[PDB]
Structures are given as structure tokens and as C-alpha cells.
Amino acid sequence: VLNTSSPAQQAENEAKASSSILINEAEPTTNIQIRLADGGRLVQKFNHSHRISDIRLFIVDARPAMAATSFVLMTTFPNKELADENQTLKEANLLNAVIVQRLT
Amino acid sequence: LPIDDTVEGITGNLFEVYLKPYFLEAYRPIRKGDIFLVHGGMRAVEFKVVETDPSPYCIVAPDTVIHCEGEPIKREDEEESLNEVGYDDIGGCRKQLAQIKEMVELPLRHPALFK
């Protein structure tokens, strides 16, 4: 789908998504860019250590239409699926990687 | 653009299995002026982009609606004219070409070199 959120509400949604994710200063910080399904839009806001479910909650707080529609994330050409949302970033190869989102 | 040197041998619809499982829900960068040979349906298929409107540094996704074009036409004359000239295609007159570059240095990438 397209950007169902209002452009005036986009800044508030991104501020709420940034405030929902805690920021750490004593850890080696990574940054994860997710290729969104609304046209390939990109956002750059992530902390050092989190989970895939934290990425899902960041997407939910970023756009209100993603809460009502389920999605399965993917990455660029391993031909695999990003399941197991409680897994960390160490074993999921999500270290400054590319996450592609498809609505179910 | 499909090309009959590669895609000919498999038929069907023009967004069929021959490009599905690598550009499934893609949003991968295609570019006008780029031709890439991807194997699909047990056959290599080339893909030349020839027309794109919305900001030609563009994105297509074959899980969305595709304006698929299905004319296999050779462009071997265009393939030989894809490069068709270059600085590597000019030899022996490096000082003259350097002088020409010094003369035409102003219309490209430095128009404000008038002060």
C-alpha cells in the first residue's frame, strides 16, 4: 500500500518511533535501513543491540497502517525469509543490512 | 525489452516465471540504459529498460502491476554502438585531446569559471 499516514503526521510518527527506541552510548552502534513497501522509502534510526521484533515495532510506530496489516520482512538475495522476530542481530546478519518488507 | 537471442524458447505472459523468483516483491533498482541477463524458466533472459517516466533513477517491482513489453528485437547494431566512441578509442593524439578538453572544460561541470 501507499503512505496512509498524513504528511503532517509523518514527523510525529517518526518522532514517536525514535522515542520508542532507546539510544545507547556505551555500545558499538549499528544502523539498519529498511526498504519500505510504500515506494522504497528509507529511514535511518536504530540502536546497537535490539531484535527483529524491535524492527517490527519501529515499523509499526513509523506508520500506523503497518499495525493493521501483517508483513514478513526479507533481505536482498539470500532467497530466505526473516522469521523468528525475537532473535538478535548477531545470527540474523542484520549489521547495516537491507531489509525488504512485503505485506501478507 | 526481451531479446530473441536469449529469451526465445520460452513463452507465456510477459511477467511470468522467467523473472519472478529473483524479483519477487523486489523494489530493486532498474535503470534506463541497463541490460542484465537473468536465467529464468531454465533459460537466460536479458532485460533492457527503454522507457521510464517517474525520476529515471527508478524502481520496479514485478509483484506490483507491470507495464510489461514483450517484443523480442535484436539491437546488435546498437550493441556495437553502445560504446561507439571513447577516450580509450582515441590514441596517439593525447596532447590534442587534452587541449580539446581544456577548451571544452567550461560548458561541462564548471560553468562558473568566468571570474
Coordinates of C-alpha atoms in Angstrom, one line a residue:
Chain A
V1 CA 0.0 0.0 0.0
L2 CA 0.9 3.7 -0.2
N3 CA 1.7 6.1 2.7
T4 CA -1.6 6.1 4.6
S5 CA -0.3 8.4 7.2
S6 CA -0.7 12.2 6.8
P7 CA 2.4 14.2 5.9
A8 CA 1.8 16.4 8.9
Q9 CA 1.6 13.2 11.0
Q10 CA 4.7 11.7 9.4
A11 CA 7.0 13.8 11.5
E12 CA 5.1 13.0 14.7
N13 CA 5.1 9.3 13.8
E14 CA 8.8 9.3 13.1
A15 CA 9.4 11.2 16.4
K16 CA 7.3 8.7 18.3
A17 CA 9.3 5.8 16.6
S18 CA 12.6 7.5 17.6
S19 CA 11.4 8.0 21.1
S20 CA 10.1 4.4 21.4
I21 CA 13.6 3.1 20.6
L22 CA 16.1 3.7 23.4
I23 CA 19.5 5.1 22.4
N24 CA 22.8 3.6 23.8
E25 CA 26.1 5.4 24.1
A26 CA 28.4 2.7 25.7
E27 CA 27.8 0.1 22.9
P28 CA 29.0 -0.3 19.3
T29 CA 26.1 1.3 17.5
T30 CA 24.8 -0.2 14.2
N31 CA 22.2 1.4 11.9
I32 CA 19.6 -0.6 10.0
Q33 CA 17.9 0.7 6.8
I34 CA 14.6 -1.0 5.9
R35 CA 13.4 -0.8 2.3
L36 CA 9.7 0.0 2.8
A37 CA 6.8 -1.2 0.6
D38 CA 5.3 2.2 0.0
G39 CA 7.7 3.1 -2.8
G40 CA 11.1 2.1 -1.4
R41 CA 11.2 4.8 1.4
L42 CA 14.2 4.7 3.7
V43 CA 14.6 5.6 7.3
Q44 CA 17.9 5.7 9.3
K45 CA 17.2 5.3 13.1
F46 CA 18.4 2.3 15.1
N47 CA 20.5 1.4 18.2
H48 CA 23.3 -1.1 18.8
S49 CA 21.6 -4.2 20.2
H50 CA 17.9 -5.0 19.5
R51 CA 15.7 -7.7 18.0
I52 CA 13.8 -8.2 14.8
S53 CA 10.6 -7.7 16.8
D54 CA 12.1 -4.3 17.7
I55 CA 12.4 -3.6 14.0
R56 CA 8.7 -4.6 13.6
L57 CA 7.7 -2.3 16.5
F58 CA 9.8 0.5 14.9
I59 CA 7.9 0.0 11.6
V60 CA 4.6 -0.1 13.5
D61 CA 5.4 3.2 15.3
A62 CA 6.7 4.7 12.0
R63 CA 3.5 4.0 10.0
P64 CA 0.1 3.3 11.5
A65 CA -1.0 1.2 8.5
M66 CA 1.6 -1.4 9.3
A67 CA -0.1 -2.4 12.6
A68 CA -3.4 -3.5 10.8
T69 CA -1.6 -5.3 8.0
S70 CA 0.8 -8.2 8.7
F71 CA 4.2 -8.3 6.9
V72 CA 7.1 -10.7 6.5
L73 CA 10.5 -9.0 6.2
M74 CA 13.1 -10.1 3.7
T75 CA 16.7 -9.3 2.6
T76 CA 18.3 -8.7 -0.8
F77 CA 19.1 -12.1 -2.4
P78 CA 19.6 -14.9 0.0
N79 CA 16.1 -16.1 -1.1
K80 CA 15.1 -16.6 2.6
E81 CA 12.5 -15.2 5.0
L82 CA 13.1 -13.1 8.1
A83 CA 11.0 -15.1 10.6
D84 CA 11.8 -15.6 14.4
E85 CA 11.2 -12.0 15.5
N86 CA 12.8 -12.4 19.0
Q87 CA 16.2 -13.3 17.5
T88 CA 19.1 -10.8 17.8
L89 CA 21.1 -9.1 15.1
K90 CA 24.2 -11.3 15.6
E91 CA 22.9 -14.5 14.0
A92 CA 20.4 -12.8 11.6
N93 CA 23.1 -10.9 9.5
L94 CA 21.4 -7.6 10.2
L95 CA 24.5 -5.5 10.6
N96 CA 23.9 -2.4 8.4
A97 CA 22.0 -4.7 6.0
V98 CA 19.0 -4.2 3.7
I99 CA 15.5 -5.2 4.9
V100 CA 12.7 -5.5 2.3
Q101 CA 9.1 -5.6 3.6
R102 CA 6.2 -7.4 1.9
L103 CA 2.7 -7.2 3.2
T104 CA 1.0 -10.5 3.7
Chain B
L1 CA 13.0 -5.3 -23.6
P2 CA 13.3 -9.0 -24.2
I3 CA 15.9 -10.1 -26.8
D4 CA 15.3 -13.1 -29.1
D5 CA 19.0 -14.2 -28.7
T6 CA 18.2 -15.1 -25.1
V7 CA 14.5 -15.3 -24.2
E8 CA 13.3 -17.2 -27.3
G9 CA 12.4 -20.7 -26.4
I10 CA 10.0 -19.9 -23.6
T11 CA 6.6 -18.2 -23.9
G12 CA 3.7 -17.2 -21.7
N13 CA 2.7 -13.9 -20.2
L14 CA 5.3 -11.2 -20.1
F15 CA 5.7 -11.1 -16.3
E16 CA 5.8 -14.9 -15.9
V17 CA 8.2 -17.3 -14.0
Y18 CA 11.2 -16.3 -16.1
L19 CA 11.7 -13.2 -13.9
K20 CA 9.6 -14.0 -10.8
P21 CA 11.7 -15.7 -8.1
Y22 CA 14.6 -13.2 -8.1
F23 CA 12.4 -10.1 -8.4
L24 CA 9.7 -11.4 -6.2
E25 CA 8.3 -8.3 -4.3
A26 CA 11.5 -6.7 -5.5
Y27 CA 11.7 -2.8 -5.4
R28 CA 15.3 -3.4 -6.9
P29 CA 16.9 -0.6 -9.0
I30 CA 16.5 -1.0 -12.7
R31 CA 17.9 1.8 -14.9
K32 CA 17.1 3.0 -18.4
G33 CA 20.2 2.1 -20.4
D34 CA 20.9 -1.1 -18.4
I35 CA 20.6 -4.7 -19.8
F36 CA 21.1 -7.6 -17.5
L37 CA 20.9 -11.3 -18.4
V38 CA 19.0 -13.3 -15.7
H39 CA 18.3 -17.0 -16.0
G40 CA 14.6 -17.8 -15.7
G41 CA 12.5 -20.8 -16.7
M42 CA 15.7 -22.8 -17.5
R43 CA 16.7 -20.1 -19.9
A44 CA 18.8 -16.9 -19.8
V45 CA 16.7 -13.8 -20.2
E46 CA 18.0 -10.3 -20.8
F47 CA 16.2 -7.2 -19.6
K48 CA 16.8 -3.8 -21.2
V49 CA 15.0 -0.8 -19.8
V50 CA 14.0 1.6 -22.6
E51 CA 11.4 3.9 -21.1
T52 CA 10.7 5.2 -17.6
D53 CA 8.8 8.3 -16.5
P54 CA 8.9 8.9 -12.7
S55 CA 12.5 10.1 -11.9
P56 CA 14.6 7.6 -14.1
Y57 CA 16.8 6.6 -11.2
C58 CA 13.9 4.3 -10.8
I59 CA 12.4 1.3 -9.0
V60 CA 10.2 -1.5 -10.4
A61 CA 8.7 -4.5 -8.5
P62 CA 7.2 -7.4 -10.5
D63 CA 4.8 -8.2 -7.7
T64 CA 3.0 -4.9 -8.4
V65 CA 1.4 -4.0 -11.7
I66 CA 3.9 -4.2 -14.6
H67 CA 3.6 -2.4 -17.9
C68 CA 5.3 -5.4 -19.4
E69 CA 6.5 -5.2 -23.0
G70 CA 7.0 -8.4 -25.0
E71 CA 8.7 -7.6 -28.3
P72 CA 12.0 -9.6 -28.8
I73 CA 14.0 -7.4 -31.1
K74 CA 17.8 -7.6 -31.7
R75 CA 19.9 -4.4 -31.2
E76 CA 23.2 -5.8 -32.3
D77 CA 23.9 -2.6 -34.3
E78 CA 23.1 -0.7 -31.1
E79 CA 25.2 -3.2 -29.2
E80 CA 28.2 -2.3 -31.4
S81 CA 27.2 1.3 -31.0
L82 CA 26.7 1.0 -27.2
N83 CA 30.1 2.4 -26.6
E84 CA 30.7 3.7 -30.2
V85 CA 33.5 6.2 -29.1
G86 CA 35.7 6.9 -26.2
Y87 CA 39.0 8.3 -24.9
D88 CA 40.2 4.7 -24.9
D89 CA 39.1 4.7 -28.6
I90 CA 41.4 7.6 -29.4
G91 CA 45.2 7.0 -29.4
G92 CA 48.4 8.8 -30.5
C93 CA 47.0 12.3 -30.1
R94 CA 46.8 12.7 -26.3
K95 CA 48.1 16.3 -26.4
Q96 CA 45.4 17.4 -28.9
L97 CA 42.6 15.7 -27.0
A98 CA 43.9 17.2 -23.8
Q99 CA 43.9 20.7 -25.5
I100 CA 40.3 20.0 -26.7
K101 CA 39.3 19.0 -23.1
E102 CA 40.9 22.3 -21.9
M103 CA 38.9 24.2 -24.4
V104 CA 35.5 22.5 -23.6
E105 CA 36.2 22.4 -19.8
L106 CA 33.8 25.3 -19.3
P107 CA 30.4 24.1 -20.7
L108 CA 30.5 20.9 -18.6
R109 CA 30.8 20.8 -14.8
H110 CA 32.4 24.3 -14.4
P111 CA 30.2 27.0 -16.0
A112 CA 31.1 29.5 -13.2
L113 CA 34.8 29.6 -14.3
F114 CA 34.3 33.1 -15.6
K115 CA 35.5 35.1 -12.6

